[PDB]
């Protein structure tokens, strides 16, 4: 059977007994930087195993009125194990990721989720011509809430769901790498995202490589059961991570 998948990175393993295939970015597997493409001179550091392992971020609660959530990487893993320490102590970094989003419910539940990784997901402020701090869009591993109605607080990003906070039709996000979690026939989605950027390496504190979005297209529904919500969990694992430019801790 092809409905069972097993992934082993570092000293952690993920087993899903009911899943679809794995999607692989734009058909490119993560890999180390080549000699003929590099620019920095000094020797890089490659702490595999220590950093290439699964890290389960916190969990969210899926209610009948949920609208969606997003996380921004790699800042989401800023304080997660040795990955965070290496990112703090180095000027440059480079790594692909494997994203696994779990969500299980009985045969009598119905709903559908869209899981998509949006590279360079620039967002606009709630009030045009008004700047916002770096806290209404990323504050560690905590998830951020979309809003059904138009946002009004100037201190926050525009959270209108149907525009995805990017000024584009939400239904067109299918262009990016993605998967669907349909409770009828699925329990998890796996995405392998290679390193996509305009330069060989970049600082991980100043640049958000890509954004993860989970949007319920078909709202959750059930009847006459003792379960009131469906927890959702997200797990990530850097792949082929290498750092460079050692300096004092930020």
């Amino acid at each position: 059977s092809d409905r069972v998948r097993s992934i082993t990175l570092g000293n952690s393993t993920i087993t899903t007994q009911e899943c679809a295939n794995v999607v692989v970015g734009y058909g490119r597997w993560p890999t180390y930087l080549r000699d003929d493409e590099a620019t920095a001179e000094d020797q890089p550091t490659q702490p595999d195993v220590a950093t290439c392992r699964f890290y389960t971020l916190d969990s969210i609660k899926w209610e009948k009125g949920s609208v969606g959530w997003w996380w921004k990487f790699p800042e989401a893993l800023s304080d997660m194990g040795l990955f965070g320490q290496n990112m703090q102590y180095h000027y440059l970094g480079r790594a692909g990721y494997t994203i696994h989003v779990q969500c299980n419910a009985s045969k009598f539940h119905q709903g559908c989720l869209l899981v998509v990784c949006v590279p360079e997901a620039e967002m606009g402020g709630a009030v045009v011509g008004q700047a916002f701090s770096a806290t209404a869009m990323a504050n560690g591993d905590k998830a951020y809430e979309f809003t059904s109605a138009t946002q009004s607080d100037q201190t926050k990003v525009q959270t209108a769901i149907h525009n995805a906070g990017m000024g584009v039709g939400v239904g067109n996000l299918t262009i990016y790498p993605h998967q669907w979690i349909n409770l009828r026939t699925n329990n998890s989605a796996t995405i392998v995202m290679p390193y996509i950027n305009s330069v060989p390496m970049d600082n991980m504190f100043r640049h958000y490589n890509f954004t993860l979005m989970v949007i319920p297209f078909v709202k959750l529904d059930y009847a006459d059961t003792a379960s009131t919500y469906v927890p959702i969990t997200v797990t990530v694992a850097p792949m082929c991570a290498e750092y460079n430019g050692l300096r004092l801790a930020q």
Binding site: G25, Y26, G27, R28, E37, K107, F108, H109, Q110, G111, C112, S148, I161, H162, G169, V170, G171, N172, T174, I175, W180, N182, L183, R184, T185, P194, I196, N197, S198, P200, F217, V218, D221, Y222, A223, D224, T225
Partner: protein
Amino acid sequence: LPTMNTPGSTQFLTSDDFQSPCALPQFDVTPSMNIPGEVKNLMEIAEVDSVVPVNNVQDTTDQMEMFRIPVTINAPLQQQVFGLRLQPGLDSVFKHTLLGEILNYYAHWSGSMKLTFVFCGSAMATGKFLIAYSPPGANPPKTRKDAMLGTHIIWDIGLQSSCVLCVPWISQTHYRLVQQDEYTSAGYVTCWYQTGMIVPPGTPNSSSIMCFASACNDFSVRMLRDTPFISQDNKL
């Protein structure tokens, strides 16, 4: 060397191909890097699926409702689920889809289309649906007996939650106008209950369906035009 200038000299044509001097002689460009995801033709984009907002009921307080087609239990027999015109570049349904956006940059189009439907009900729910494509005619179908005459597929809901209806390219001309009219009509697409939806005890009484639109491998476009969806009144 005697010469004579022909008409058109000293004109500026915005779509010409001529050599011109370089303003930065012997400039060293940055080495190329193979970034993942290179795209070499807009059709590659056009063949990707995208959700179609079929539920345009003029009363959608919540915008997200536009992407879900209601379905009920104990439905009258042989009822219509939805209907729409096949005008990918003009109809409001396909106007803003990932496919529709590409066509609006062109004037002519041709080829077949794919409509994919996914049932997002419960696992215990079951049903059958009839999806039919009616070529152009004097009147659109009104009942299942009329619809079933044209191209159609009977969809059974089971372990496989998705079904694909391939709309064939039937036309008197090699190409069709994006700004479609009576002359270059394309027909209609409708869906009807085949058996009805049945559910066991302790399940929701309603479900939803979603539709995806994309182009086949024979699709193509021609003549570039400027899109009409975006406009400005003053310099930014």
